[PDB]
């Protein structure tokens, strides 16, 4: 979690420098558009339902699900739906990465690589 | 021409002191860019961060008026 908060803190920094020009989105720079377009994205992630707790493998995973660009292709709606099919997924047939993360909370190459290579077969292959 | 009125029609016209005239037309052209770009930087900082910084904040005020603290 460390190591992935970074990029969370950053986009929302960056979405929170443009607070006036929200509402003349027209008159803007194509750059400052994009930004705003990604702090949107995250905005619409950061939200939760009540009595649903998350453990730390479900943060990692939607954290690095966000980090790297994996939820710029859909619209600002259906955002949580796509978070929780992707969070059931990954419980319904990648347990043992989940247990591992869940009880130890380290980060190494092959864990990363682990993560994502199963985000990207959920891209495909699958619905929200 | 004609014996009682004499009248020339020319799409681009400008008194020829040389054989070209670009390097008098370009002084021109530089002069409308400079304005141009001067005027949409006025219009932008004038209009656009003003009236929104005016605009953030009043709501916080008017919803206290009747406070006793």
Same mark, same amino acid.
């Given at each position: %979690?460390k +190591?992935?908060?970074?990029?969370?803190?950053?986009?929302?920094?960056? @979405?929170?420098?443009?607070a006036?020009?929200?509402?003349?989105?027209?008159?803007?720079?194509e $750059?400052?558009?994009? =930004?705003? &377009?990604?702090?949107?994205? *995250?905005?619409?992630l /950061?939200?939760?339902?009540? @009595?649903?707790?998350y453990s730390?493998?479900?943060?990692a995973?939607? *954290?690095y699900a966000?980090?790297?660009? @994996? /939820?710029?292709?859909? &619209?600002?709606?259906? %955002?949580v739906d796509?978070?929780?099919?992707?969070i059931?997924?990954?419980?319904?047939? @990648?347990? #043992?990465? /989940?247990?591992?993360?869940? &009880?130890?909370?380290?980060?190494?190459?092959? %864990? &990363?690589?682990?993560? +994502?290579?199963?985000?990207?077969?959920?891209?495909?292959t699958?619905?929200? | 021409? =004609? #014996?009682? *009125?004499?009248? *020339?029609? $020319?799409?681009?016209?400008?008194?020829?002191?040389?054989?070209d005239?670009?390097?008098?037309?370009?002084?021109?052209?530089? $002069?409308? =860019?400079?304005?141009?770009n =001067?005027?949409?930087?006025?219009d932008?900082?004038?209009?656009?961060? $003003?009236?929104?910084?005016?605009?953030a904040?009043?709501?916080?005020?008017? +919803? %206290?008026?009747?406070?006793?603290?």
């Open positions: %979690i +190591k992935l908060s970074g990029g969370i803190r950053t986009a929302l920094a960056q @979405y929170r420098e443009l006036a020009f929200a509402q003349f989105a027209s008159d803007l720079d $750059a400052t558009r994009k =930004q705003l &377009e990604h702090g949107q994205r *995250v905005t619409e /950061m939200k939760q339902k009540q @009595y649903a707790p730390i493998a479900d943060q995973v939607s *954290v966000s980090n790297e660009g @994996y /939820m710029a292709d859909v &619209e600002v709606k259906k %955002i796509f978070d929780a099919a992707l059931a997924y990954f419980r319904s047939e @990648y347990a #043992p990465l /989940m247990k591992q993360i869940d &009880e130890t909370g380290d980060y190494n190459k092959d %864990i &990363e690589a682990a993560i +994502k290579a199963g985000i990207e077969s959920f891209k495909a699958q619905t929200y | 021409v =004609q #014996p009682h *009125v004499v009248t *020339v029609l $020319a799409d681009t016209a400008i008194r020829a002191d040389n054989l005239e670009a390097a008098i037309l370009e002084a021109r052209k530089n $002069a409308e =860019q400079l304005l141009a =001067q005027k949409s930087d006025l932008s900082a004038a209009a656009l961060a $003003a009236l929104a910084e005016t605009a904040q009043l709501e916080t005020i008017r +919803k %206290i008026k009747n406070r006793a603290q």
